[PDB]
Amino acid sequence: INIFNATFKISHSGPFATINGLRLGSIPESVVPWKEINAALGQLILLLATINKNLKINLVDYELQPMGSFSKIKKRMDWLILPVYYDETKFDKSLETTLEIISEITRQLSTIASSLELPYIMNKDKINGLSVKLHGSSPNLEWTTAMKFLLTNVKWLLAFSSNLLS
Numbered sequence: 001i002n003i004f005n006a007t008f009k010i011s012h013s014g015p016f017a018t019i020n021g022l023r024l025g026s027i028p029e030s031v032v033p034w035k036e037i038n039a040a041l042g043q044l045i046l047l048l049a050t051i052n053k054n055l056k057i058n059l060v061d062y063e064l065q066p067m068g069s070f071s072k073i074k075k076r077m078d079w080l081i082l083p084v085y086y087d088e089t090k091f092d093k094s095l096e097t098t099l100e101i102i103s104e105i106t107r108q109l110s111t112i113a114s115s116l117e118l119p120y121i122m123n124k125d126k127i128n129g130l131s132v133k134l135h136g137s138s139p140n141l142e143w144t145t146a147m148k149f150l151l152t153n154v155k156w157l158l159a160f161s162s163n164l165l166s
Helices: 034-054 090-114 141-165
Strands: 010-013 016-019 022-024 062-065 072-076 079-083
Touching: 010 141, 016 034, 016 141, 022 034, 022 141, 034 062, 034 090, 034 141, 062 090, 072 090, 079 090, 090 141
Parallel strands: none
Antiparallel strands: 010 016, 016 022, 062 072, 072 079
């Protein structure tokens, strides 16, 4: 396993995609506590910052701030601090921005490679056609699946980042 795969195991349990065992999503049948969801998001943000740190990726308009269950993203607009956790909404904007960031890291990764593409398309708040936003409402199967697509995209991003470091 690579240096990233070693610390971040992205897999799936039942209908939930998981990162180091933490389920990123929640459905009425099997409710996942926000503490778990926020910790999962925290690990994702840390994972992304890890890739940027190691591959020397410079994000001009964004700044990742891993902070456990209260992780944040600073978006230049001076900067707007978005909460990548819960407890339309600022949370919704953090998730869409996470997609923007994944796209940007991917773009710079391909640049570095030349001197790389993810499986699911990300357009605004939608990944593979599903929205990462729940507008204040509680998680549903759609959002849970959208998150599954997001982590799959990240799992690939991870792989590429590792191949390059070789």
